[PDB]
Write a protein that binds this ligand. Structure first.
Ligand SMILES: OC[C@H]1O[C@@H](O[C@H]2[C@H](O)[C@@H](O)[C@H](O[C@H]3[C@H](O)[C@@H](O)[C@H](O)O[C@@H]3CO)O[C@@H]2CO)[C@H](O)[C@@H](O)[C@@H]1O
Ligand SMILES: [Cl-]
Ligand SMILES: [Cu+2]
Length: 235
């Protein structure tokens, strides 16, 4: 149970984005139905009044929280991966539009899931803004909590993989467009009951065997991190 509070751009806090530049849902409950329209941008997908200006190559940091800013972030039980996707905003997230910029699942070196490291990072994970066409975009940050993912939601709707989905409105101003954005995958649609990484038993199956759901990270993607960029306590 987690939500995005706002974003940072090059370590500069853009301020509380909830219902402002984040298409915030009404609460932190997960999406679990893989064929739900709610898989696009969570249960209240609509245009919000602001879009955060960035340039290609900026560090864009998403900041999550549980109940209040810079708290426990997400229950520690919620082990799983983190991904970020991008789509042109005029799509409203519909159709074959979502391109993956970032994946972090289980780090064998550290013996930790992405969610574990997100807690340590005070809810902060970042991407490099890619060199796509200037314009308005949706950045779809997705945490998958796997603590009930041994079941398919379609078999037992009390369980299933849990999707914490947050769409941020980002405007890319300065970009050379050296990596034009291709078509991508649909949400809902990209994840199905047979997709690797959707049904996974963290109690019985080693995390060293976990394969995150496709698609693969796009060749145009410039990377990211799970790390505290900004100190909310200094404000
Ligand atoms: O026992 C089932 C699993 O529970 C997990 O805790 C979640 C609770 O089930 C859920 O009721 C609670 O929801 C809170 C939410 O956290 C809070 O922010 C909001 O204000 O109110 C909701 C209640 O209406 O969320 C927790 C997760 O934080 C356990 O984490 C899990 O191990 C356990 O299997
Ligand atoms: Cl839960
Ligand atoms: Cu939860």
């Amino acid at each position: 149970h987690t939500l995005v509070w706002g974003v940072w751009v090059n370590g500069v806090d853009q301020g509380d984005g909830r219902n402002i530049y984040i298409r915030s849902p009404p609460n932190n409950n997960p999406v679990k139905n893989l064929t739900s329209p709610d898989m696009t941008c969570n249960v209240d997908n609509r245009v919000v009044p602001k879009s955060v200006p960035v340039n290609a190559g900026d560090t864009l940091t998403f900041e999550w929280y549980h109940n209040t800013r810079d708290d426990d972030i997400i229950a520690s039980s919620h082990h799983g991966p983190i991904a970020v996707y991008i789509a042109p905003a005029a799509s409203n997230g519909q159709g074959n539009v979502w391109v993956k910029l970032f994946e972090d699942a289980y780090n064998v070196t550290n013996s930790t899931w992405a969610v574990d490291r997100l807690i340590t990072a005070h809810g902060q994970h970042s991407v490099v803004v890619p060199h796509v066409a200037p314009g308005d975009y949706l950045f779809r940050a997705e945490i998958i909590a796997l603590h009930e993912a041994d079941s398919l939601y379609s078999q037992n709707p009390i369980r299933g993989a849990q999707f914490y989905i947050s769409c941020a409105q980002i405007t890319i101003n300065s970009s050379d467009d050296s990596t034009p954005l291709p078509a991508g995958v649909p949400f809902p649609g990209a994840y199905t009951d047979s997709t690797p990484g959707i049904q996974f038993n963290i109690y019985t199956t080693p995390a060293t065997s976990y394969v995150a759901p496709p698609p693969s990270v796009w060749s145009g993607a410039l990377g990211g991190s799970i790390a505290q960029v900004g100190d909310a306590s200094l404000e």
